[PDB]
Amino acid sequence: LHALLRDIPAPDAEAMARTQQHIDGLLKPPGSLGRLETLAVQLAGMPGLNGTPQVGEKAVLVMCADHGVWDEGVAVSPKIVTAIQAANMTRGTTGVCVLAAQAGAKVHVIDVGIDAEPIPGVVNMRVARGCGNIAVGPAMSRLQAEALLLEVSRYTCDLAQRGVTLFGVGELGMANTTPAAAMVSVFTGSDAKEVVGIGANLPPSRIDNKVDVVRRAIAINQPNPRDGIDVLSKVGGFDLVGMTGVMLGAARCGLPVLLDGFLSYSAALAACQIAPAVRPYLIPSHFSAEKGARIALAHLSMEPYLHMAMRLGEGSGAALAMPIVEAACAMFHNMGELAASNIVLP
Amino acid sequence: LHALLRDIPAPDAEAMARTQQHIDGLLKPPGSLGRLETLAVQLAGMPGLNGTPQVGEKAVLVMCADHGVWDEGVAVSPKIVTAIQAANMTRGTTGVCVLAAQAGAKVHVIDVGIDAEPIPGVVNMRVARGCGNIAVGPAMSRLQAEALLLEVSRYTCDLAQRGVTLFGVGELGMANTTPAAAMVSVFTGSDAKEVVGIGANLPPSRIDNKVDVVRRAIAINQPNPRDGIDVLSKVGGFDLVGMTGVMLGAARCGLPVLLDGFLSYSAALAACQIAPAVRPYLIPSHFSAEKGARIALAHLSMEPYLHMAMRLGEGSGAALAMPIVEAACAMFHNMGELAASNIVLP
Ligand SMILES: COc1ccc2nc[nH]c2c1
Numbered sequence A, B: 001l002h003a004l005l006r007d008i009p010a011p012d013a014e015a016m017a018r019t020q021q022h023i024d025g026l027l028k029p030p031g032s033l034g035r036l037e038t039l040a041v042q043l044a045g046m047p048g049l050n051g052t053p054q055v056g057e058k059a060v061l062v063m064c065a066d067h068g069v070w071d072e073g074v075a076v077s078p079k080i081v082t083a084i085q086a087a088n089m090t091r092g093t094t095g096v097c098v099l100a101a102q103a104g105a106k107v108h109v110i111d112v113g114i115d116a117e118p119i120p121g122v123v124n125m126r127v128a129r130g131c132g133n134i135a136v137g138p139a140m141s142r143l144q145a146e147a148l149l150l151e152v153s154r155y156t157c158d159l160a161q162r163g164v165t166l167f168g169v170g171e172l173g174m175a176n177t178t179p180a181a182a183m184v185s186v187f188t189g190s191d192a193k194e195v196v197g198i199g200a201n202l203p204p205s206r207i208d209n210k211v212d213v214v215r216r217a218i219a220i221n222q223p224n225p226r227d228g229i230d231v232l233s234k235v236g237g238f239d240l241v242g243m244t245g246v247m248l249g250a251a252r253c254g255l256p257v258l259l260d261g262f263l264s265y266s267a268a269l270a271a272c273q274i275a276p277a278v279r280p281y282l283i284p285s286h287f288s289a290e291k292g293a294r295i296a297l298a299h300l301s302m303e304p305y306l307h308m309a310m311r312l313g314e315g316s317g318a319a320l321a322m323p324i325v326e327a328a329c330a331m332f333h334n335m336g337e338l339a340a341s342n343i344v345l346p
């Protein structure tokens, strides 16, 4: 793990300088393509990309897990939905599935802690049948966290070998916006009221209780903000852990990762906390409709591309942004050059 | 023309109600897919869509024209770029071309007023070799405007027959952000300073002059804000006119049109001014980096999906949004249903 972390490559500034130069000479007013240009330069700096903005195979990793905190009345979806939906993931009927297929990406369903019998077709990395209830104690042990980090990391980088160059991260677990709020609050120093959202249609009347739960998790666990692994294990969840793992793995592998929504922001705060070197590999997707979105993003210093008012999760936002990433490559590679037209612009 | 305008169909509320119902039953928390849901319902209401969100063939229409106002020192690109770039459009090397191809859309280059010899491969609808200089008089005659409106309209709806279901609109004409600013100012009642942008990298020192030019165009022409055709003809341009025409045609045809950036916003204000019935067919794409973007959009009551800091034009933003439109259809059609999973959500 310390190994893994140490070995995260820095971006190739040399490749980046060449990219910029090339971009500047394309058939257009310099910088006219805004964020598409920036995006492309960002990709060129990623070592696993071979000095150029390029997209090979695409995968979306969905981390599924149940949470003890569900018993605190924080989630109106019935617990079993995790298991059901997870199964659906295997049939290509979910929101992520549909969106991924549209993006030509492949969805990988990973069970890291579902409170149900194993589901065939789902990758089994199950830590336990749901995590501990953060309202009265830690979600899991430090060891348990580090281990999953390792395991997910590896799996992630291993896909790299199969030709994957672009990752999308997602989750599935009833009541997960709660631990998410807790983490944000902790890493960010914001009060719970500020970061707690309605999750999957939580009735306005039930908000108050959700906030209390969050505050409690915090007070009881005393998670240390300067220690991401500490935070994750105490008030996080299996699914949160797994997302952070994907992020560490893609970074170690020198590859780009597309974030999703609020849950994903939480995991990104942790990964950056654990390894700042991770930052440059992260790519925002959309701007989640969850209440704590703006704060979480501000702390990440990220401005998403898409404003869709989405709040489904599953990695649906991630899939949705893939074409944008492809567009930047097409731009980079297929556009003609000013010089070839004898055009000169200031 | 009065005919055309009269015959613009209202959206099918019945189809819309069925869409919503169907959407609500999909494998997810109701409304969790935000704007993607809204988008889909919007499409279902379009008569040319056959009661459902669907996308057949896709086309991007690029209106190219030169402007007399170029002589007022408002644009740093050399005039000839219109002609050059237009030619490039025919080779698939431009920004729109690259983006359209990525979206599987076809680009249609239309010459409505280029100040150069005709370009083979380009559709010829040339009104004149550039429009009049708005700083000292009208861009063209009312008749000239109405005619192009008619001609572009028809061409547009005619594509509908060839299987096109989704239009994207774009332009190409050096110095065009100037007439654009003028129109915005007029329709919006904003002062020129507020709406005048840097266009294609206009040096900050040269801004002042651009604003004066705009104010002048206005004072001299006295365009009537309650008359879109009046505005267009006086301080607009051939390309502006043509964009408005695409919009009227797609609406008459009962089809959706994707807007681009600032120039496109201008044309949309005019079309809505001329025919409010046009509104429901319009679909924002991205949020242009041009200074007058926010005002123009506010007047259109539109919130774009994409924040890319783009300012290239050509219909590049339009192409970029196409996959989003496709995504809403996929969602609508390929997602599984809650009932089929025995899942019940509040
Ligand atoms: C290719 O040079 C230019 C200059 C201005 C432009 N506006 C749209 N495309 C452009 C290309």
Ligand SMILES: COc1ccc2nc[nH]c2c1
Residues within 6 Å of the ligand: A077, A081, A085, A172, A200, A312, A313, A314, B027, B028, B029, B343, B345
């Ligand atoms: C299908 O029902 C549900 C409920 C919550 C969910 N969160 C993500 N997908 C979900 C599906």
